[PDB]
Amino acid sequence: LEEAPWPPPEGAFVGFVLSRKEPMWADLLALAAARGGRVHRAPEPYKALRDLKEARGLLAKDLSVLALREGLGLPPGDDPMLLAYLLDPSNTTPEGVARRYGGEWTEEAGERAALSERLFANLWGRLEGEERLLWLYREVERPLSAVLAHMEATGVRLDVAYLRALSLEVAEEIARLEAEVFRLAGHPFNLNSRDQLERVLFDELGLPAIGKTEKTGKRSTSAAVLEALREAHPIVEKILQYRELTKLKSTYIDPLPDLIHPRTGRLHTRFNQTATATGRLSSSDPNLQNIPVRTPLGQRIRRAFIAEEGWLLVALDYSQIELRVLAHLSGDENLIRVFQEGRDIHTETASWMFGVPREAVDPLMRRAAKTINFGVLYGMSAHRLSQELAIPYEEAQAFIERYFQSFPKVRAWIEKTLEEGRRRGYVETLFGRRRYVPDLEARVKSVREAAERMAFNMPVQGTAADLMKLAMVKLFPRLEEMGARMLLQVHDELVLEAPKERAEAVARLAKEVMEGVYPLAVPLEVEVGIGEDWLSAKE
DNA sequence: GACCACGGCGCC
DNA sequence: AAAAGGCGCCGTGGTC
Numbered sequence: 001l002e003e004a005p006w007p008p009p010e011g012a013f014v015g016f017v018l019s020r021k022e023p024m025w026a027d028l029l030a031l032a033a034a035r036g037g038r039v040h041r042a043p044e045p046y047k048a049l050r051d052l053k054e055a056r057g058l059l060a061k062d063l064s065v066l067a068l069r070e071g072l073g074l075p076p077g078d079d080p081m082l083l084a085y086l087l088d089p090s091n092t093t094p095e096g097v098a099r100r101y102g103g104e105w106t107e108e109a110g111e112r113a114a115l116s117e118r119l120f121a122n123l124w125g126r127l128e129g130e131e132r133l134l135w136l137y138r139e140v141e142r143p144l145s146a147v148l149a150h151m152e153a154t155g156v157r158l159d160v161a162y163l164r165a166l167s168l169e170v171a172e173e174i175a176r177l178e179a180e181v182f183r184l185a186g187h188p189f190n191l192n193s194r195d196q197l198e199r200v201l202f203d204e205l206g207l208p209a210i211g212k213t214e215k216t217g218k219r220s221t222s223a224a225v226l227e228a229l230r231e232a233h234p235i236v237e238k239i240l241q242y243r244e245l246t247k248l249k250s251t252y253i254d255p256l257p258d259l260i261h262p263r264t265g266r267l268h269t270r271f272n273q274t275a276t277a278t279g280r281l282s283s284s285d286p287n288l289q290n291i292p293v294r295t296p297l298g299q300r301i302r303r304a305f306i307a308e309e310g311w312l313l314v315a316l317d318y319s320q321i322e323l324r325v326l327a328h329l330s331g332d333e334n335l336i337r338v339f340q341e342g343r344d345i346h347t348e349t350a351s352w353m354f355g356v357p358r359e360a361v362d363p364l365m366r367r368a369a370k371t372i373n374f375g376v377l378y379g380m381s382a383h384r385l386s387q388e389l390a391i392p393y394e395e396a397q398a399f400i401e402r403y404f405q406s407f408p409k410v411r412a413w414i415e416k417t418l419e420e421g422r423r424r425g426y427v428e429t430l431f432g433r434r435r436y437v438p439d440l441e442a443r444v445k446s447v448r449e450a451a452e453r454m455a456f457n458m459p460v461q462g463t464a465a466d467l468m469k470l471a472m473v474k475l476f477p478r479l480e481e482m483g484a485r486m487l488l489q490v491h492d493e494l495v496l497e498a499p500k501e502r503a504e505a506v507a508r509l510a511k512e513v514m515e516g517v518y519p520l521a522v523p524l525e526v527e528v529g530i531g532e533d534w535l536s537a538k539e
Numbered sequence: 540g541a542c543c544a545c546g547g548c549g550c551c
Numbered sequence: 552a553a554a555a556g557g558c559g560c561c562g563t564g565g566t567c
């Protein structure tokens with residue numbers, strides 16, 4: 001490639017080097033561009049940003065986020081990572097994509113710009129004729145990256161002072177619990193080390209080991225094991241409570257406050273677009289898709305996520321969505337009827353599990369029932385199921401058989417999906433997003449059957465994810481015009497931020513965009529709440 | 540100071 | 552732990 005003075009012609013491909021992986025926190029070390037056998041290197045990266053109309057190339061969204069941070073409206077365009085991910089979702093890094101489609105991910109901006117141009121040419125080649133994947137790239141992924149760049153640059157407000165104070169309280173509680181554990185053990189040890197804890201529990205206290213760890217075959221001290229040992233010794237309960245508190249403290253309460261960005265005063269995650277095997281997004285640095293919600297302390301942490309002053313959060317969450325998707329994909333009449341009658345399978349299982357009326361079921365019960373409903377659907381064993389409901393194995397088995405006989409066509413769809421996956425080497429969502437599952441023909445049963453569970457889950461989970469992505473693409477422009485903001489996506493949920501005066505109107509509109517994203521054989525319903533914090537907005 | 544594998548566990 | 556699927560981050564232990 002011939003050297004050429006900055007700036008590049010229009011439609012050139014950018015390369016850029018960051019001091020670190022997080023766009024919002026990174027120094028832009030270099031910027032380059034390449035077009036028609038040329039490479040232009042920017043003498044000064046930051047100012048050189050101003051000369052671009054579009055971030056076009058590998059990891060375009062990241063450079064776009066960094067541009068937004070500097071007050072520049074530089075939207076992301078074509079990105080070869082998105083083409084590769086669509087061809088095969090195991091294409092998740094530029095290191096791999098480069099090696100696979102004609103180059104090498106280096107640490108120099110010019111070489112990255114050139115790699116972007118080459119990779120785009122080649123990958124675009126692979127996608128000619130793949131009309132459904134092309135529809136996904138133009139109508140969903142490429143536009144979605146623009147939406148994601150904005151969400152990343154916006155961030156969410158956090159109640160820092162509140163978390164600081166909460167930390168001090170939980171610290172004292174943790175001290176009480178570890179002091180108890182050591183007294184019962186008859187000596188101190190690192191309660192954080194599951195190796196040391198294993199020795200205390202199963203060698204010194206001589207408790208019955210229940211399970212082994214996967215890789216190294218040690219005696220497990222997992223929550224499930226400890227739960228089966230609640231009655232066997234007083235120390236077990238204290239260890240479980242200790243685990244809850246230190247998990248929440250070390251993962252959320254302590255780290256989060258230190259991640260408030262100086263410029264924005266807000267908390268910024270990354271929304272990874274080519275990270276999962278099913279087509280879902282992931283979130284990292286920090287992960288804001290796994291903020292606690294289940295337990296009392298978890299809920300207090302969720303309360304820390306608040307709206308800007310004079311604004312409200314709007315939380316919208318698809319109802320029983322993967323079950324609705326499954327009704328459509330499978331064509332099961334009984335299942336479709338359930339949704340056309342406005343029934344609620346999670347609530348129905350909850351009232352059965354806890355032997356209470358439908359009206360007596362609370363949120364924690366329903367959430368319990370959800371892990372049961374999806375667990376069983378995607379292949380949970382009778383033994384495990386019996387352990388979690390704490391019912392006899394025989395009853396666990398009856399639950400699973402009635403579950404599937406209640407919806408006859410589901411098992412048929414599964415078998416059809418696996419057969420097709422064996423012939424073609426891949427399975428696909430409603431929109432033709434693919435996941436290759438070669439192990440469908442493994443000669444080892446356990447490997448083969450693990451692959452089968454991955455294979456028939458993918459169309460379901462991936463269609464739900466397709467729907468949300470499309471809903472976000474349709475929704476974003478409508479929010480901009482109303483002066484509202486899109487903050488987070490948590491798979492089948494969206495968290496927005498609206499001026500108080502317009503929160504109500506924004507909520508109704510978002511609900512309708514999401515419900516009408518793409519009509520199915522069953523209605524899509526969206527539960528929506530409004531509130532000053534994330535907890536309040538979900539009900 | 541940085542890797543990693545591992546067990547473990549938070550959420551969807 | 553166990554035939555649920557999909558993620559990312561924690562501390563420990565071990566290494567470089």
Ligand SMILES: Cc1cn([C@H]2C[C@H](O)[C@@](C)(COP(=O)(O)OP(=O)(O)OP(=O)(O)O)O2)c(=O)[nH]c1=O
Pocket residue numbers: 317318319320321322323346370371374375464491492551556
């Ligand atoms: C808890 C859980 C979730 N999911 C999946 C399957 C599911 O449809 C979703 C897309 C969203 O989760 P959700 O909103 O909590 O639940 P629903 O949408 O089904 O119902 P509502 O409460 O919203 O009415 O992730 C699992 O695969 N395993 C799990 O343990």
Ligand SMILES: [Mg+2]
Pocket residue numbers: 317318319320321492
């Ligand atoms: Mg939902």
Ligand SMILES: [Mg+2]
Pocket residue numbers: 317318490491492493551
């Ligand atoms: Mg949800």
